[PDB]
Design a protein around this motif. Structure first.
Motif, short mmCIF file in Angstrom:
data_model
loop_
_atom_site.label_atom_id
_atom_site.label_comp_id
_atom_site.label_asym_id
_atom_site.label_seq_id
_atom_site.Cartn_x
_atom_site.Cartn_y
_atom_site.Cartn_z
N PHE A 36 -5.13 6.67 -7.67
CA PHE A 36 -5.29 7.99 -7.51
C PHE A 36 -6.37 7.91 -6.25
O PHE A 36 -7.35 7.43 -6.28
CB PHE A 36 -6.12 8.59 -8.64
N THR A 37 -5.60 8.43 -4.96
CA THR A 37 -6.36 8.39 -3.67
C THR A 37 -7.38 9.38 -3.70
O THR A 37 -7.23 10.93 -4.02
CB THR A 37 -5.41 8.48 -2.64
N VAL A 38 -8.53 9.05 -3.52
CA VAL A 38 -9.84 9.91 -3.70
C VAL A 38 -10.37 10.37 -2.37
O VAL A 38 -11.21 10.96 -2.24
CB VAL A 38 -10.69 9.51 -4.63
N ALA A 61 0.79 -1.06 0.03
CA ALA A 61 -0.25 0.12 0.10
C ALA A 61 0.82 1.30 -0.06
O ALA A 61 1.99 1.29 0.50
CB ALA A 61 -0.90 -0.14 1.28
N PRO A 62 0.51 2.38 -0.55
CA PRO A 62 1.06 3.65 -0.32
C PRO A 62 0.83 4.06 0.92
O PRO A 62 -0.07 4.12 1.80
CB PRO A 62 0.12 4.43 -1.39
N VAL A 63 2.23 4.16 1.65
CA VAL A 63 2.27 4.82 3.04
C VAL A 63 3.37 5.98 2.86
O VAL A 63 4.69 5.62 2.36
CB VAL A 63 2.77 3.68 3.86
N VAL A 66 -8.91 -4.53 -2.43
CA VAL A 66 -9.30 -4.13 -1.07
C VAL A 66 -8.27 -3.84 -0.24
O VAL A 66 -6.91 -4.65 -0.38
CB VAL A 66 -10.37 -5.01 -0.50
N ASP A 67 -8.27 -3.13 0.78
CA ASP A 67 -7.21 -2.84 1.85
C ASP A 67 -7.94 -2.89 3.04
O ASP A 67 -9.17 -2.63 3.25
CB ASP A 67 -6.34 -2.11 1.37
N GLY A 68 -7.26 -2.63 4.37
CA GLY A 68 -7.58 -2.39 5.46
C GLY A 68 -7.53 -3.70 6.39
O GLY A 68 -8.23 -4.61 6.26
N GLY A 69 -6.51 -3.85 7.44
CA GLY A 69 -6.44 -4.85 8.18
C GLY A 69 -6.13 -6.33 7.72
O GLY A 69 -6.15 -7.42 8.49
N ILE A 70 -5.51 -6.44 6.65
CA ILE A 70 -4.93 -7.62 5.94
C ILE A 70 -3.54 -7.94 6.94
O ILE A 70 -2.81 -7.16 6.82
CB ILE A 70 -4.52 -7.64 4.50
C1 LIG Z 1 -0.48 3.35 7.79
C2 LIG Z 1 -0.40 4.42 6.79
C3 LIG Z 1 -1.42 4.40 5.91
C4 LIG Z 1 -1.49 5.46 4.83
C5 LIG Z 1 -0.33 6.57 4.88
C6 LIG Z 1 0.38 6.40 6.09
C7 LIG Z 1 0.43 5.51 7.01
C8 LIG Z 1 1.32 5.33 8.10
N1 LIG Z 1 -0.59 7.56 3.99
C9 LIG Z 1 -0.50 8.81 4.52
O1 LIG Z 1 -0.35 9.08 5.62
C10 LIG Z 1 -0.82 10.00 3.60
C11 LIG Z 1 -1.60 10.91 4.78
O2 LIG Z 1 -0.44 11.73 5.29
C12 LIG Z 1 -2.73 11.74 4.27
F1 LIG Z 1 -3.61 12.44 5.14
C13 LIG Z 1 -1.99 10.16 5.83
O3 LIG Z 1 -2.83 8.97 5.97
O4 LIG Z 1 -1.38 10.23 7.07
C14 LIG Z 1 -0.71 7.28 2.85
C15 LIG Z 1 -2.00 6.18 2.80
N2 LIG Z 1 -2.82 6.17 1.67
C16 LIG Z 1 -2.41 6.81 0.47
O5 LIG Z 1 -3.12 6.60 -0.50
N3 LIG Z 1 -1.34 7.67 0.50
C17 LIG Z 1 -0.70 8.11 1.60
O6 LIG Z 1 0.21 8.72 1.49
N4 LIG Z 1 -2.23 5.27 3.75
C18 LIG Z 1 -3.36 4.31 3.56
C19 LIG Z 1 -3.00 3.11 3.19
O7 LIG Z 1 -2.73 3.08 1.63
C20 LIG Z 1 -3.89 1.97 3.35
O8 LIG Z 1 -5.04 2.33 2.75
C21 LIG Z 1 -3.87 1.14 4.80
O9 LIG Z 1 -2.37 1.11 5.37
C22 LIG Z 1 -4.62 -0.13 4.88
O10 LIG Z 1 -4.45 -0.27 5.94
P1 LIG Z 1 -3.75 -1.41 6.87
O11 LIG Z 1 -3.05 -2.22 5.64
O12 LIG Z 1 -2.63 -0.32 7.10
O13 LIG Z 1 -4.70 -2.16 7.79
#
Ligand SMILES: Cc1cc2c(cc1C)N(C(=O)C[C@@](O)(CF)C(=O)O)c1c([nH]c(=O)[nH]c1=O)N2C[C@H](O)[C@H](O)[C@H](O)COP(=O)(O)O
Ligand SMILES: Cc1cc2c(cc1C)N(C(=O)C[C@@](O)(CF)C(=O)O)c1c([nH]c(=O)[nH]c1=O)N2C[C@H](O)[C@H](O)[C@H](O)COP(=O)(O)O
Ligand SMILES: Cc1cc2c(cc1C)N(C(=O)C[C@@](O)(CF)C(=O)O)c1c([nH]c(=O)[nH]c1=O)N2C[C@H](O)[C@H](O)[C@H](O)COP(=O)(O)O
Ligand SMILES: Cc1cc2c(cc1C)N(C(=O)C[C@@](O)(CF)C(=O)O)c1c([nH]c(=O)[nH]c1=O)N2C[C@H](O)[C@H](O)[C@H](O)COP(=O)(O)O
Lengths: 331, 331, 331, 331
Positions: free
Chosen positions: B151-153, B74-76, B258-262
């Motif tokens: 594209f994160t929406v 996932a994008p983190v 899908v994602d979240g909690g895998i």
């Molecule tokens: C754990 C985590 C997730 C994100 C990010 C950071 C961190 C630490 N992203 C961001 O931090 C960007 C953002 O600063 C924006 F407000 C935030 O959420 O804090 C990250 C993100 N998803 C995404 O599309 N881009 C992001 O850059 N996500 C969401 C993930 O892509 C993904 O949807 C989740 O990790 C899925 O849940 P898991 O597999 O963690 O249970």
């Protein structure tokens, strides 16, 4: 001992931790192990009143033999892990209680020795990489007087047992597979077995309705609706949650047994009310074996027998067939 | 490490508290964060037996590339928060495991550097107040060899992260957005992106059925059914609870991830059985990165690969397509 | 303060135990009090993405006035119990936030004094043994510029408050009913009130669908779907569990508000998505009052406003009307 | 005492442990005992508002007598276990409260002595191995002025009480069955009783819908929908979960009572709303007896009376018939 739970405490005291864990554990996060219990706890029986209970009988006829209870001892490998007399202690107690005993492919005493105990035993088959070895076991079992082949179909390989991994568990040098690896079995394997014996073939580990139907079409005499006590696929549905649907789909075409989490006569009643022909009981029999050997297993079976009789009569059932006609409600 | 949970403990030990909290936390009361786990725990698989498992393969084809597993990283954002090698460590491990890696708009190493690692990466886009900046990132990503635009929406702005507020969390001076704010994206933004690239556009953060349908109509190549790991709307339904309905509604018109909690191969199987093309995995990859850098991520991916293979075979599935045809039951 | 829960801790510190208990408590076993929270926790929102959020507005029009949020301060008796400025502090903060404030029949400052604060307030009526006294309060309220009569219909007498009984709770000598017993109100009482004022009459404490319908037939301008914060019938269904059914049955014939357990902007969103025109908030406003007087209530309302805006936008809603068209899923 | 729960604490203090356990306990794992409580806790009432409450009455007519509440004291054997005045203390308090008292076959004071207290009592029958003994008890009860025969049909034998087994519980020498074993009763037994008396025959322990229907066909004047307080079949559905279905099936052909877990006036209201004519209350009456003898039971009945009146009025019910027309919702 006044419940099966008394014996688990006793077995935990006596067994080495890693052996207790091999016995107690499941695969993965143990979701399916816990769900087997949760599923039974959610089932409630709607008892009948005011019926004739002058001659309550817990007997059934299954695979051509009368059994004293709608219950058999599940196949559990390597029983010498739990007590030095291992399978012989359990088989003797089962015989004396009139309960079928399932001799394992991975028994720690040879199948012929266990069969010589008597009690008209069953034999549990694993399909092996060398096919001829599996078919030879079938013929050995039949020659020794086993009365059914319980073909376990849910072990193409062993599940991921995190307790065993964390403990670094291995068999002690004093415990071996006395009948002597896993190959995936297929429907072809089932036909090979069916052609090799006139004994009833019982497929153990069926959870999908279509697989139950296909089992009947394949000439199975029975199925055991089972997630292997939560030891194989973690996240597999409990058998008890599939049982009613499966019973309806086979519509009397084979015997339908269930296992996983049976811990009382009341649980036996629930399984029966959901349509099971009989149950298998695994871990509790091993608790009793660990706690007190043959006499322990005897006491467990006498307790279960009393609990089954008690539950049946309280529910207005003079026979197991009547118990199968009980209704249930989820809570 | 024998489960993904082993790595969370390891990451908590090593990371500064406020960084662990930035990683672990969700928005609001963390209702959606917890529900992502609860939702998976309630799903049980109905496995099939007796199928040919001679050549079990976990591979998929997605967005024109073979992937080794039905999984991508996932994008983190800001992976240098967790280890000094940050995104490069994770991208290298993903490449070696044959798993797609999603390069973030907010990466702490430039997208061109991460792309140079190889492994046919994807690029995650945020829409920015300056539109031309977002479209320039798209073209940069494409020029660097990224193979999809994710594209994160679901981020018109960042959700309310109470852990981060309570900690007074801010990026260390040594971590920056190396590709260089949020503007709400609209369907118009999607069309602008679709017109700017021939790469597949994947809309991440879709939960409503009608939005999934509209995504297909808009020319999306995929969607990720997602509540952003519980970090955006607190009280948003888990993706896993919408997935089956969404899969039915799109009826093969785009890939549905899908994602979240895998947290295991079994969870991957559940997602697949509910109809997912693939999953994304976020927090666990960062746990592995924090615990042991590139080698940590490698070990995590090897563990996940083994768990996926194990679960598939135990469920009677020689391919991911077969896994998608499994049925499930809620418990 | 970053959540409403921060303020409860603060109020528990400062208030005498018996006063905190008068505020926190419910009737009987507090089943309905707990269920108000449980019911909201089970609701999940299905957010929409990619909508125009250029001008997100949380405003509504209700009973002929614009309100800044879909929220009003619930009628809570005897606010001088919690802070010396009592109702005046709360009314001033509500006015400044553009939120309606409901002046109570059992206010500890006279209704005319509280109305003089401004902010276009509402007035909550109890039916009294002397009918003329109740109708005089209505006319007083109208003469003082109150804009709606909130007729509380769920108190033929006070519920059994076991905390208050165990504490031996009584009002301090310094707190009185400044507008100066309970008589059961009937539909006849409603008509008497409707005939006595041209202000909208809002019936508070409706839970049965047929009573909501009858309220519309009776000429009510609104209802509040409510179990009185779990303080009246112990075992009464939460309002949030009846709200959707009630909204459908009235089919736009009156405003439908809800209360009980609203503790965040996300909860406001859930109520809106289930069809509420607006919510009332009770205990949290008193926590803020106890913790920091007028400024405390101001901070609470600013926090709620931010949380409502945040939740709405994350859910793709530029207006409250859009939020009412969101779908939900039970978890 | 402000709730029934106050009295349990008081009884635990005073009674010997093994006697408290005989009172509190159920059969098996106590699944049905716990479910009786869980089942009531899941029921929520939908109250009505704005109805005339000028003359709220909790009275009912049942089996030809007015009763002050829709409640009777359940048959509980051996009341001298709990207080030296035993059944006489309880019967006196019931008489004074206008509540029917059920004299037990296993009473520790003779049925004629308890009947001489007055208050138009009922008599609970067990079928005994010697039939003539059971029919003699019926005639004794009728001659002594009992007004109904409560034939308990769920005890072909006593359930397995693991607390009693573990404690080695036996009656003290000072407590005896003063009216002087169990035989299964059948429908034939019911007819024998019906032919022997003109008193209404009430079958206690009915849970199956078909058994309720058959009870009506058999000439029963009432049934008690009951799992015997979780003391008989462990895993038997709670009566409260069968009550609505049973009420519908009998369609006014006999009175339908319920018992199991009634612990407040609100619980009485729930039972009424599900269609019960009346409830029985067991353990709480014994708690009161143990805690404070006759005066204790008086206080309990006054508390229950107040709670029933309170709940009824808060729910908009001026009569028990109105309460039966309330709707409910599961939570
Ligand atoms: C754990 C985590 C997730 C994100 C990010 C950071 C961190 C630490 N992203 C961001 O931090 C960007 C953002 O600063 C924006 F407000 C935030 O959420 O804090 C990250 C993100 N998803 C995404 O599309 N881009 C992001 O850059 N996500 C969401 C993930 O892509 C993904 O949807 C989740 O990790 C899925 O849940 P898991 O597999 O963690 O249970
Ligand atoms: C508790 C237990 C069970 C098995 C086994 C060992 C132990 C210790 N068997 C095996 O260990 C074989 C195996 O090594 C293969 F990978 C394993 O599961 O570890 C055993 C077995 N079922 C079966 O058909 N053959 C077996 O030999 N099982 C599964 C049982 O037959 C049965 O399905 C379960 O015990 C039912 O659940 P319970 O009654 O335990 O809740
Ligand atoms: C917390 C609280 C609430 C009330 C009141 C006091 C206190 C301390 N009122 C009263 O106390 C009046 C009464 O003395 C009558 F018996 C009582 O309930 O104790 C108050 C009241 N609702 C109402 O219409 N008028 C009241 O005056 N209520 C009910 C509220 O209007 C509202 O329904 C609840 O606060 C909603 O739940 P929350 O938002 O608290 O979860
Ligand atoms: C608590 C209790 C109950 C009984 C009894 C004793 C005690 C201590 N009776 C008996 O003990 C008889 C018996 O010895 C037979 F096996 C037993 O249950 O131990 C009692 C009885 N119900 C009945 O019809 N006759 C009895 O004599 N019951 C069942 C009650 O009538 C009634 O059904 C339950 O109390 C209802 O649940 P509660 O209101 O307790 O939740």
């Amino acid at each position: 001992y006044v419940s099966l739970a008394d014996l688990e405490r006793a077995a935990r005291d006596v067994l080495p931790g890693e052996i207790f864990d091999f016995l107690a554990g499941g695969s993965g996060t143990e979701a399916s192990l816990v769900a087997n219990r949760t599923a039974l706890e959610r089932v409630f029986v709607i008892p009948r009143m005011l019926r004739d209970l002058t001659d309550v009988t817990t007997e059934i006829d299954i695979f051509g033999r009368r059994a004293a209870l709608p219950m058999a001892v599940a196949p559990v490998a390597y029983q010498r892990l739990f007590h030095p007399e291992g399978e012989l202690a359990v088989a003797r107690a089962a015989r004396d209680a009139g309960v079928p005993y399932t001799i394992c492919t991975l028994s720690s005493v040879s199948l012929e020795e266990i069969a010589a105990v008597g009690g008209r035993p069953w034999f549990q088959l694993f399909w092996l990489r060398d096919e001829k070895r599996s078919l030879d076991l079938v013929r050995r079992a039949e020659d020794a007087g086993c009365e059914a082949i319980v073909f376990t179909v849910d072990v193409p390989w062993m599940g991921r047992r995190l307790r065993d991994m964390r403990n670094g568990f291995a068999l002690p040098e004093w415990v071996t597979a006395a009948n002597f690896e896993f190959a995936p079995a297929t429907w072809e394997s089932v036909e090979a077995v069916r052609a090799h014996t006139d004994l009833p073939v019982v497929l153990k580990g069926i959870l999908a309705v279509e697989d139950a139907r296909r089992a009947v079409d394949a000439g199975a005499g029975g199925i055991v609706v089972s997630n292997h006590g939560g030891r194989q696929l973690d996240g597999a549905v409990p058998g008890i949650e599939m049982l009613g649907e499966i019973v309806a789909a086979v519509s009397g075409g084979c015997e339908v047994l269930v296992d996983g989490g049976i811990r009382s006569g009341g649980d036996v009643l629930k399984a029966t009310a959901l349509g099971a022909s009989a149950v298998l009981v695994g871990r509790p029999v091993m608790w009793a074996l660990a706690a007190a050997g043959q006499d322990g297993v005897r006491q467990l079976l006498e307790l279960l027998a009393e609990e089954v009789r008690d539950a049946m009569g309280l529910a207005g059932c003079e026979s197991v067939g009547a118990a199968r006609r009980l209704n249930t409600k989820l809570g």
